[PDB]
Amino acid sequence: DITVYNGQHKEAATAVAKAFEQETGIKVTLNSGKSEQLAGQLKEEGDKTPADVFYTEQTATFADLSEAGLLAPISEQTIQQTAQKGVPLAPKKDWIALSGRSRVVVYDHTKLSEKDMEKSVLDYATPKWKGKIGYVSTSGAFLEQVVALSKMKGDKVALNWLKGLKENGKLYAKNSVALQAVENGEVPAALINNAYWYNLAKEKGVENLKSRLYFVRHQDPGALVSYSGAAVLKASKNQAEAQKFVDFLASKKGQEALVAARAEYPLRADVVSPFNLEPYEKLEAPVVSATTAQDKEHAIKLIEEAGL
Numbered sequence: 554d555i556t557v558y559n560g561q562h563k564e565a566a567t568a569v570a571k572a573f574e575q576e577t578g579i580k581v582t583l584n585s586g587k588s589e590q591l592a593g594q595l596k597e598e599g600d601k602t603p604a605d606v607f608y609t610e611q612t613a614t615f616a617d618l619s620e621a622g623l624l625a626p627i628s629e630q631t632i633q634q635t636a637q638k639g640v641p642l643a644p645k646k647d648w649i650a651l652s653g654r655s656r657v658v659v660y661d662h663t664k665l666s667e668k669d670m671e672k673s674v675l676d677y678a679t680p681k682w683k684g685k686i687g688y689v690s691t692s693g694a695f696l697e698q699v700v701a702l703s704k705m706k707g708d709k710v711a712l713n714w715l716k717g718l719k720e721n722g723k724l725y726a727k728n729s730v731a732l733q734a735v736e737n738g739e740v741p742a743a744l745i746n747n748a749y750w751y752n753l754a755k756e757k758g759v760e761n762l763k764s765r766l767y768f769v770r771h772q773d774p775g776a777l778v779s780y781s782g783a784a785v786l787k788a789s790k791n792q793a794e795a796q797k798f799v800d801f802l803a804s805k806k807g808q809e810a811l812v813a814a815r816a817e818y819p820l821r822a823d824v825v826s827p828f829n830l831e832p833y834e835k836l837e838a839p840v841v842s843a844t845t846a847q848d849k850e851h852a853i854k855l856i857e858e859a860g861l
């Protein structure tokens with residue numbers, strides 16, 4: 554049996570654990586919390602941690618652990634299971650990317666069509682969109698978007714975008730609220746993540762929704778994908794089962810278990826999501842380095858400078 558420190562949504566961790574326990578008979582115990590806090594705990598616990606595996610919604614959290622010498626190597630054959638073009642790889646082969654979440658633009662298709670959409674996420678923060686573009690400045694993925702803009706385009710461009718959103722956008726407290734505002738005619742479009750819409754569509758039926766999704770693609774900063782993944786702790790003295798679990802997460806059956814539970818993009822190419830997601834390769838995500846705590850502090854400062 555193994556212990557998994559879990560920073561991912563509980564529904565995802567529960568689903569993969571259940572499918573693992575059914576396939577192998579090995580029991581999984583989840584210790585759930587925020588990834589940053591769990592990573593901190595793995596560092597403090599060191600040689601004495603009870604964690605066999607760390608399962609996170611954000612692979613960026615692995616960098617510090619790898620640097621601290623706390624992660625075990627994984628089989629190269631396992632790593633190759635999800636190594637599609639664009640997928641981040643661990644330089645020391647000591648963690649693996651498993652799934653993705655995408656930025657998107659949700660729009661009311663009864664008011665707008667793809668003719669009204671922009672080729673660049675930068676262009677939504679301009680006067681054409683005055684009073685017509687929703688955004689959620691307190692959202693984690695919104696922060697990741699700012700980080701990506703700074704990296705890809707520089708701070709002046711990132712700051713200008715934020716100022717443009719202050720001037721032209723409508724602020725919503727949460728992604729769900731922004732989605733509902735589009736559905737109810739309050740705003741014709743909003744900057745969001747893919748999962749909300751795909752969940753609502755599966756549950757309600759797309760024919761019963763006024764909103765649709767627009768993907769910018771062509772490696773625009775607005776095509777940003779955030780990656781979830783897993784790692785084995787070097788401290789584990791149950792490497793055999795820990796490695797077996799990570800191998801399983803990258804397997805067809807493990808990926809199928811995840812995508813039935815959560816509207817994330819599988820990184821195996823032979824797995825199809827029942828939420829009707831497009832294949833990962835068609836998103837044309839940009840390549841962006843991992844978000845560090847320093848990147849986050851800098852991005853928060855830009856948000857503050859913009860009056861948000």
Ligand SMILES: [Fe+3]
Nearest residue numbers: 692693728746
């Ligand atoms: Fe969210």
